[model samples]
Target: SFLHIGDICSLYAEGSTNGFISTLGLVDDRCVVQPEAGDLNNPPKKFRDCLFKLCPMNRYSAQKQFWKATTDAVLLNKLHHAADLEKKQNETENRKLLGTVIQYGNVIQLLHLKSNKYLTVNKRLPALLEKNAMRVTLDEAGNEGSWFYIQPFYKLRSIGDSVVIGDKVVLNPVNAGQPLHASSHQLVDNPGCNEVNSVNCNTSWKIVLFMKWSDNKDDILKGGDVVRLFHAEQEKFLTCDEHRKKQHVFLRTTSATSSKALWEVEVVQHDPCRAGYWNSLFRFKHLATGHYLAAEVVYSLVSVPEGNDISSIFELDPTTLRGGDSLVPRNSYVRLRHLCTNTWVHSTNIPIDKEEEKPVMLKIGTSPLKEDKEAFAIVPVSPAEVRDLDFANDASKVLGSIAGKLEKGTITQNERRSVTKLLEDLVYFVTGGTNDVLEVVFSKPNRERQKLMREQNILKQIFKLLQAPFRHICRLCYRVLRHSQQDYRKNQEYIAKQFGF
Candidate 1:
């Protein structure tokens, strides 16, 4: 396939990559070119920066109109428009064939689509490792400094010939005559962490397509494509809840259907075309429910209102996963990172309501703290388990420990609200309007009052737990106890009439 000006692809540092094909990504600072290109055998994490789209340079042209038509030029980053090919199919994207085909010896510009920044090399910013070598970086202004001469690496092709995929090339910067070289992550012997600089030896980079299969036109992950974030460790499915405020985005069992885990990923930008890049940011809307997958501290399915509604945005960061496969696989591991909060969407065993599901714990709302239990496995279907524990059996010991600490005044200050929520959820389960609980708790006859009160006394201790002077802890217990007492009095009336008392 022809590597055109508008087409998107990654620059692979094949030589210094040492068997693994690492790409030219950004460093931890993100401004400088990644000094050390890591193992790209699997898709790299910062694939967004490593990926480049070619845009033409004004070195050969004079007109502003030539910006769109400027051919045989430098690499700049931008996804091409499908102006002429609009009527291709029922639904067609705009990134098919960007501007004119790029040729060897042409000056080109490269842009990082995720950041809208142009790739540049300046002599002022010296390479970290190679003293005389210039450091490569990204720039906002797509000026003359961004120009790079695309020459065939081993003289495989002529200067004017079209640059095709798999062609090894040397990017000789117009500003600095030196070619682009990505350093190896070698130690004392070769010495120089993974850094991209304009040096002599390690300069060859292969032209590679973003997808494993080049011809699959629809391979790119875009909006409306449904995906699931599964946790391989816990085998829990990250699912949603009903239309309610702060709806707890809980974990569901494998018995839950794929529809529950299915989330429609949407591109964030108001771009001409919707393209979901390797590690680019996007919003995930749970398909089963209309709300988007969102979180601050506690994960929630936020309704679309647009007043601080951008919380649902998450970046599908390609983390450590097995098997070097395609871009959007049938399944993979990714960190569902909240763009704003910088916290991850991690799974927790701690149940929110006593019934079935539990409140999700990340480093947010109820803070899991420092633990990166954040690796979410993304799949096309619903996920798996470490099964459930007996809630009835689990409650007795939980009550004692809860009462044990709340009464002893020993639960640390930070954990008061946490214990409060636990008490609230269990209080609802034991004290709320349930048929079996009412039947077992109040239907007493003679001297068996102690046995009946034993069943009824669960709330009595929870009431004691709320003695910490916290309204949130007391709030649910207060209402449920009142309702339980009023309902008991109603039971007294019904028994009197039925038994002819």
Candidate 2:
């Protein structure tokens, strides 16, 4: 009634039923129609009525819309074939009743032909017998660890045998069946963990340093010095002491004691970003001769008003004690000694009194007599090696920033969208989702039988089309699945909101 032929035709014009019904039927029902095939109006309209009767509660007129969408004969044939299979299966099941009933007590069967079975006991009467009731015997075969005789016809055969032979032989196969060997192997490897050695090389004259600072605002302090040659000949580098004394050189150091395997050396640089605050700056320099190394120190204040426990002025490295008047390794001593000369000294421990300043100090000193430069190394820096280093550094920084944002609970909807976009872009960069990655093949069945013959005609063109650009079709399927995943992620918020947990 919603889209009856008359209603649709009347909308266009009177007497417009010439080609209107044919096209309208095909369009509304996802079907195909041929102009040479005469008017399809009557048959399609009747079929629509029949479909409506079967699916009275169906709100959408899908069949009608289908008829309006296409004019491909092959598609129409496919629709018809599918519809026929469904109809046949449904009709076959409809003939059988689903339940049974049993009658009790002696109920006499009566005959109403002038009654009384006195002297008219016809002994040679033909009895009504069920025809075409041949029993079918069934066989089942299976192995253990797989499927073992869940056949329905086997049960029917067993029942038949029990009725005739007085015993049911369930013909279970012997347990000598061998299990199939599944040679499938899972490819397992740690793809995201850092496995390279993080120590400085001893052969090459190069030093690689990696460093990272937390996203925090604080002051960090560090120091380094070169001691005089106690054993002059034993030192690896001959001009190491001179290099240290003359130039303001520092060796970028690497340490692997943290989960984030990035090593960096940073110093507080004044007026870097024009924020009126000192910014931690990072730089890399070749390995230089120095016994002591240091970094900026930072600590939190307990309270704004009536400040509580003061933290230690944590030092990055020990003070190098060099035998010189300058800040060299031999002359460098703990600043604590200079402060201890006063009334109160800065202690390593947090001061109990709020007024006292707790200084964090470190002493990277070497014995005046001891001299060893085993730490310096000449490491090779190939293009490949440098590329890998750069890759690792970049990945670490990006991952670290992402991890920080995620941990800090500042991620917004737009941030999540950006992350999704980033991940999608990464996928594209990793592998261009294309047909070359996968292919689909179509195998046509031998149509020697009637059933095969009927189905072959319907799938022949489809199979041909599928075979032509099988790889393209496969890519399309993959793209569809990818799009589905993206959509699911997009809609995941609705599910999250619903669960509330």
Candidate 3:
């Protein structure tokens, strides 16, 4: 953990990139030490200036060589080699301490053996002698891939006490690898309303912080670590790298003079967070002023999951009880089924009108052109109720309808797709995709339909995709458990019969 020394603090993008921690920190201690206010705009005042010079800029740089040696793989290999050598040495010492009979030229000679089995073998003669040799060979080989494969290379053990940091830190096998300096800081970019209007700008500043973690480990998340983003003003937990995509969950705030223009082209706004190749930007506008604002946040391409495979568990063995006692109790026998659908799309079948999840509407103006500020209540929608919307026509009416449908019965996984597609189109249309909106139309019903369509469509798609695997795995699990139960019963019966029960 590193602390900031000056008024200017450096931020670390606490995540992985290309199997390494991608980061930029101030290298020179003086980089943060400012000598008076006159040199505020100097390049040295910028955190990255010193870091770029000291840290490796690319693979060819000297710093990378040191980083490679300290990586998890190298350290693990060293530990394995040491363990193997130690095992062989101990086996030799044990053999020397115990005496055993050896036949040489029809004469018996004594040699040290590790086990008291020497006496047993002497009694059983050839039979026990043959058995002992076979057992020893089998034990020496061990299981090909067991503990060694599961454990992370005893990285901490290998990294004893010191590290070599020239351009990069050099890891030693006998000595502990150098400790990684991890820290977090905030970066804010405020392109005010004036900035948005003057240059026809998108009106938002994008901030990107990069870093490389200690050990240069590829998959830190696999180690159960996570990085998260929070909204400073609203105190909202925006998203985390733990999930597939960083979620941006927020309510839409808008104003309108009448019900007609309510769903018309006004300001469509979204959180300024972007995941992967997609940008999540929405338009926000003051209905009366007609001035719109939009923001876009971007995360650089970092380490992504290697394989995306589906796993299964069968029913019947639903509990999937196995060898040995389990530390945790097994789940009850319940047939949890999953329906197969497309992978790329996600659908959410939420009721369009759940008064329980509605926001407290507040009026913002007075008289004829007066409007109400509908603070978008960012809450989760349930799968039931019974309101499906018709987005092609009246949006708000459709939204109300979807809400009704959700309140009824389970919304099928398939319908969620169509609804999500409608939502995407609306967001794209609202943001004007190009980051510029000349004119706008606002409709309350239409707007609500767009929102409902987006929500249900995405949810439905996701449910359908996840449902299939869940069912498959559950079935397999149940089958295993059922077989185990039968085996236990049979074993009990055998014991009873043997005891003349």
> What's the TM for model 1?
0.38
Model 1 alpha-carbon drift over 4 Å, by segment: 17-41, 58-97, 184-193, 211-501
Q: What is the lDDT of candidate 3?
A: 0.21
| Residue-wise C-alpha lDDT for candidate 2, range 1-501, written one tens digit per residue | 011100101000011111111111110111111222223222212111111100001111233233455255657667655655654553354223111110111111111101110011111221111111111111111011111111112244432121121111111111212111111111122121111110111111000111111111122222111111111122212111122233221111111111111112222233111001111222222222211121222211111111011221111111233222322121122222111111111212222233534421111221112222212221112223222233223333443445466555555656455334433332332233322133211222111211211121211221222222324333432331232223333223433442353
Candidate 3 lDDT over residue span 152-183, tens digit each: 12244232222111112211111111112111
Weakest 10 consecutive residues, lDDT, candidate 2? 4-13
Instruction: Highest TM-score: give the candidate number.
Output: 1
Compared with the true structure, all predictions reach lDDT values of 0.51, 0.21, 0.21
The best candidate in terms of lDDT: 1
Ranking by lDDT: 1, 3, 2
Q: For residues 169-280, could you state the per-residue lDDT of candidate 1 as single tens digits?
A: 8878886658876655332322324556676765577776553223223434544345666776766777665423455566665433433455656666542123455546
TM-score of each: 0.38, 0.16, 0.15
Compute the lDDT of residue 304 as modeled in candidate 3.
Answer: 19
